[PDB]
C-alpha cells in the first residue's frame, strides 16, 4: 500500500492467465510489468468481455494518451479514474471502473 511498490491497482509482474483471471467484471483493471519486455508497463482492463492490454510506456519511455501525458504511471491510473475517462491507444478506449487489489508485489 505505497506507491507502485504496493499501490491498490499495481499487481506487479503478472502473467496472461493470472491478469485475465483478475478481470471478473467488465470494468476491473490493473497494471503489471511486461515479462517479455523488461522495463515496460501494461494495463489489463476489461471493457466489455474483451480484455485490453496497453503499454503504459511508449517505445521511448513516455506514458501518454491520444493527446495527454502522465508525469508518472501512478498519475495515469489516477487521471482516468478521476474522470472515468478511457486511456485510448491504437483504437481501444480502455475505460477504468474498479481497481483490483494487490499491495505486495513490485520489488
Amino acid at each position: 500500500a505505497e506507491q507502485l511498490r504496493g499501490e491498490p491497482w499495481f499487481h506487479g509482474k503478472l502473467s496472461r492467465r493470472e491478469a485475465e483471471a483478475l478481470l471478473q467484471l467488465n470494468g476491473d483493471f490493473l497494471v503489471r510489468e511486461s515479462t517479455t519486455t523488461p522495463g515496460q508497463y501494461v494495463l489489463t482492463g476489461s471493457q466489455s468481455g474483451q480484455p485490453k492490454h496497453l503499454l503504459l510506456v511508449d517505445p521511448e519511455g513516455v506514458v501518454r494518451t491520444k493527446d495527454h501525458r502522465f508525469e508518472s504511471v501512478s498519475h495515469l491510473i489516477s487521471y482516468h479514474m478521476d474522470n472515468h475517462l478511457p486511456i485510448i491507444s491504437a483504437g481501444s478506449e480502455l475505460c477504468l471502473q474498479q481497481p483490483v487489489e494487490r499491495k505486495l508485489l513490485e520489488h
Binding site: L43, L54, D58, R64, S89
Partner: peptide, 14 residues
Amino acid sequence: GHDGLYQGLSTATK
C-alpha cells in the same frame, strides 16, 4: 516480427 504487441497509450507513429 511481429508480435503480440501490446500497444501503447499512446501512439501512433509509425
